[PDB]
Structure formats: structure tokens, C-alpha cells
Symmetry: C3
Subunit: 149 residues, 3 copies
């Protein structure tokens, strides 16, 4: 009994792992994930940058980061309203870095941005026209998480 | 060896349990669940109150209940049409109680309601405007379930 | 004690099986699944018929098939644009069959369709008004899958 029951349970676990993987595939599909492309998801809730970071991390994702014009538009369509991007110059003023590390490979700043206006702006929002503007990380913007391709 | 196989399998199970919980979190988020707020969801099907109660229970949820104006609006936008609420006055006419227990606190009655019209109306529906109207439980209204915050 | 650990593992696995099924049920409900009815899902991605079939099959579903006017309207609403249906006359020109087997019964062909235009058209697409047209399986249309009732 012992060894047989153990061997079976191993098959039971393997079966459940496959089922859960398929469930995740179906869930990603319904969330709009295109084949071989990373995808963006939002609950349409507005919150400060720190809360967005924590939220996406818990979901094992990251704050949405556009690496090109296509992805920039994609985020825009998902968010619908101004949302935070996973880009800040919190570590060193003037040096915008990805929250995942590294300097920007792609940008789409509005004229005269980023300006660190007034009291300061260390976060980035993608406006309702695709251009970027740095804003206060304390302002409440739409939470948009990104998941791997 | 057996003890090692067993320990290793317990580890796989814990990981799988954590992974499914993550799947649940991401799903709720994609469906609009806000931070620290109850999750309201509908399949847009209209049915009698008894079926709504049965359906939500099968999903391990309950018929949506607005505890305040904020939740009332949240349910209003998920339903979009007239939907049953988890409130009835079947025990003592005029005394509305939540299906999960307790006396009705927050209410948002429409003018001249509740009127227990005709043969009697013991269920409650949140109509398009967000206001409430008492209606026969046998009538078919949208099914909206609620899950914990 | 080995046997005690084994029995707990079985209870852990069975609890996990039930929870995964609850997750699947809740996901179907959120996707608009009506009681005792099959449901449809789409990621809004356009691809050739062979790709759609492969995708749905991988998710344990099939390319959407309207068996009546109700299902047709439902698919039309999910798709939003022209999408492939799980119906083709690839095996024998002129005789449309469901990808899962059997000859086509209910149909909703547009005026003067099907016409196997030019070199040929063996796949079927549901257009914006809900009517059908036969087209090349090589063309890219929205991927819409159906899952069991
Ligand atoms: C004066 O106050 C208002 O009076 C009207 C009419 O009595 C109420 O609306 C009726 O509500 C009853 C609920 O028991 C029914 O829904 C009536 O509707 C039908 C019906 O019985 O199903 C619709 C049928 O199509 C109709 N038959 C035909 C052949 O047309 C049928 C007959 O006319 C009826 O049997 C004759 O007695 O009537 C409604 O007309 C108002 O109640 C409010 O609105 C309704 C629609 C419900 O939502 C109630 O919960 C509301 O209180 C009532 N309003 C107030 C403020 O008192
Ligand atoms: C009178 O009957 C009607 O005839 C027209 C013209 O042939 C059909 O429309 C064509 O259908 C074919 C189906 O294979 C293609 O969709 C044609 O479209 C293209 C194409 O071949 O992809 C579009 C290309 O952009 C175009 N090329 C350029 C450079 O512009 C190309 C060329 O014109 C063509 O290849 C030259 O050889 O045409 C359609 O024009 C009608 O078919 C029906 O409507 C179309 C749009 C499809 O939905 C078909 O499945 C429909 O049956 C046809 N209608 C009927 C009722 O018989
Ligand atoms: C190109 C440029 O430099 N433009 C300047 C404006 O900044 C641009 O637009 C604003 C809206 C932001 O998007 C910037 O990122 C962008 O560069 C600038 O506008 C002012 O910017 C500051 C940024 O620190 C701020 O957004 C001002 O709005 C608020 C504020 O957040 O501080 C909005 C608050 O709701 C409001 N408070 C209340 C209680 O209503 C405050 C409040 O009025 C001030 O704190 C009072 O001191 O303002 C926004 O106006 C503009 C300002 O002069 O200058 C442009 O050159
Ligand atoms: Ca700074
Ligand atoms: Ca700055
Ligand atoms: Ca700025
Ligand atoms: Ca009564
Ligand atoms: Ca009553
Ligand atoms: Ca009434
Ligand atoms: Ca053919
Ligand atoms: Ca012809
Ligand atoms: Ca053909
Ligand atoms: Ca045709
Ligand atoms: Cl800041
Ligand atoms: Cl009643
Ligand atoms: Cl073809």
C-alpha cells in the first residue's frame, strides 16, 4: 500500500500542476493576452505609486512598462485613464530608471518633460494621448500590472 | 527514501496551494476587485431569488449586499440592470434582514417603496438608478454575487 | 508516522482539487457562463483558422459553434468583430461539418453565401451583423473559443 499510494499521489500532484497551468492559460487568454506577447491588466483602481508596485509584485507581475510605441498604446487602451508606468528617477534625480532596473531604452516624453515640477515629480504617467509626463508618486493613478510574454 | 519522497511531495503541495491563491488574486483583480473592498461579480443572467442564492453559494459566495452608498454604487455598475440584493422581509413584513443575518442598516429606497404591492413583495432589487424597490422573489432579476475583501 | 502523513496528503490533494474546481467555476461565471450553457471567450486576437483551432484545443475547448440563434447572438457579442466558427467543408467540398464532428444543421448564412469563391473558401466566419460567410482558412479572423455547458 504505502509505496503504491505514494506513487499515485505523485501522479495526482503532477496532474494538478498541469490543470493549474491550463487554468492560468485560459485566464491569460480571457484577460486579452496575445500569443507570445506580454500582457497588461488593471482593476481600474487609482492609487499612489508605492501601492501599485506592492500590488503588482503580490500578483507576481510588475508595474506596466512600455518598451516601444506598440506597448505604449497597449497600456493606454488597457488603463483608459492616466496610469503609472514602472519608471521613476527616485534613486537619482534626473535619471529615470525602470523599476526592474536599468536605464530607459524607449521614451515618449511630452515637450519640456520630465520637469520635476514644484515640490517634485519622480513618477511617470502616460496621459490620454500617449505622451509621457513625470508626476508626483503620491498622486492616485490607475494601477496597471504587466505579465511576461 | 520514503520519508524523503513524502517530505518532497508536501513541499510541492504547498507551492501548488500558493500558486492557486495567486490565480484567485489575479482573477479578482482583472474583474475589478478594489483593494480592501468586497468583490462583486455577475454573469448577467436573470433568475428568481432562490436560484441567485443557490448559484452564489455554489461559488462559495453570497448574494451581493450594499452595506453603504459606496458598495451600492459598486454593485450598480457591475449589474447595470435590475438585480436582486441579499435582503428580504419574509420573517416580519417591513423588517428587512440580510440573507447572511442581521437587520437592514443602510437602505436606498425609491419613492413610495417599499409597498409590498399586490400579493406581496418580499425581495429587494437595486434598479438602474441605484435606488431600491421591493419585489416578488419569484420574478427574474440579474444574479450578482459577492466575495470577501 | 508515515501513514498519518500520507492521509493528510490525500486530504490536502482533495482539498486542492475542490478549490481548483471552484476557481474554474468562478472564472466561467465571470466570463458570462449561463447556468447549464456553454460559454465563449476571446482574447480578441486575429489569426488563421489552424491557429485558432490549436489554441482552443490547447485550452480544452473548441472554435465557437453557434447551434442556434441564442448562441449565435452570444458569440457575436463576445467576438465584437468577424471571427472564425468551428465549421468547415475542408473534408468534402460543399458539405459543412462541425470541427468536433457531424453535419451542419442550424445555419445563418448571409444572402448568396456560401459560395466557395474563386480558388476556394473552406472556413466560416460570423460577421458583425451575426450572419455567416465562408472564407479562406488562411485569412486572419478573431479567435473565439467555446467551453462545455
Ligand atoms: C398606483 O401604484 C402603482 O400601481 C401599478 C399597477 O398596479 C404597480 O405596478 C404593477 O405591479 C404589479 C406587481 O404585482 C405587476 O407587476 C403589474 O404588471 C403586470 C403584471 O401583473 O405582471 C404586467 C402585465 O403585463 C399586465 N397584464 C396585461 C394583460 O397587460 C398586468 C395586469 O395589468 C395586472 O394583473 C392588473 O392588475 O400587470 C404592474 O403594473 C406599481 O408598482 C410598482 O411597479 C411595479 C412594476 C413593481 O415593480 C412594484 O414592485 C412597484 O411597487 C404601483 N406603484 C406604486 C408606487 O404603488
Ligand atoms: C460578384 O461576387 C462577388 O465578387 C467579389 C469579387 O471577386 C467577391 O469579393 C472578393 O472575394 C475574395 C474571396 O477570396 C476576396 O476576399 C477579394 O478581396 C481581395 C482579396 O483577394 O484578398 C482584397 C485584395 O485587397 C484585392 N487586391 C487588391 C490589390 O486590391 C483582391 C483583388 O481584387 C483580387 O484578388 C483580384 O484577383 O481582392 C474580394 O474582392 C465577393 O465575395 C464575397 O465578398 C468578399 C469580400 C468575401 O467576403 C467573400 O468570402 C464573399 O463571398 C463575391 N460575392 C458573392 C456574393 O459572390
Ligand atoms: C510645462 C510646465 O512646466 N508646466 C507647468 C505645470 O506642470 C504641468 O502640469 C501639471 C498639471 C503636472 O501634470 C506637471 O507634471 C506638468 O509638468 C504646472 O502645474 C502644476 O503642477 C504641479 C506639480 O507639482 C501640480 O500638479 C499643480 O496642481 C495641483 C498640485 O498637485 O499641486 C493640484 C492640486 O489639486 C492643488 N491642490 C488643491 C488642494 O486643489 C494644487 C494647489 O493649487 C497648489 O499646491 C497651490 O500651491 O495644485 C499644477 O497646477 C504649472 C503651475 O504653475 O506651471 C507650469 O509651467
Ligand atoms: Ca526626486
Ligand atoms: Ca524627478
Ligand atoms: Ca511634469
Ligand atoms: Ca411579506
Ligand atoms: Ca414585504
Ligand atoms: Ca414594490
Ligand atoms: Ca474545398
Ligand atoms: Ca464563383
Ligand atoms: Ca468550400
Ligand atoms: Ca464566401
Ligand atoms: Cl514624487
Ligand atoms: Cl415575495
Ligand atoms: Cl480555404
Amino acid at each position: 500500500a504505502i509505496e503504491v499510494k505514494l506513487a499515485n499521489m505523485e501522479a495526482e500532484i503532477n496532474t494538478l500542476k498541469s490543470k493549474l497551468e491550463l487554468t492560468n492559460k485560459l485566464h491569460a487568454f480571457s484577460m486579452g493576452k496575445k500569443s507570445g506577447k506580454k500582457f497588461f491588466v488593471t482593476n481600474h483602481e487609482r492609487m499612489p505609486f508605492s501601492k501599485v508596485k506592492a500590488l503588482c509584485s503580490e500578483l507576481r507581475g510588475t508595474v506596466a512598462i512600455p518598451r516601444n510605441a506598440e506597448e505604449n498604446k497597449a497600456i493606454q487602451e488597457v488603463a483608459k485613464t492616466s496610469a503609472f508606468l514602472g519608471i521613476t528617477d527616485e534613486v537619482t534625480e534626473g535619471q529615470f530608471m525602470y523599476v526592474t532596473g536599468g536605464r530607459l531604452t524607449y521614451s515618449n516624453w511630452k515637450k519640456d518633460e520630465p520637469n520635476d515640477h514644484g515640490s517634485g515629480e519622480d513618477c511617470v504617467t502616460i496621459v490620454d494621448n500617449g505622451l509621457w509626463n513625470d508626476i508626483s508618486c503620491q498622486k492616485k493613478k490607475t494601477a496597471v500590472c504587466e505579465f511576461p510574454a
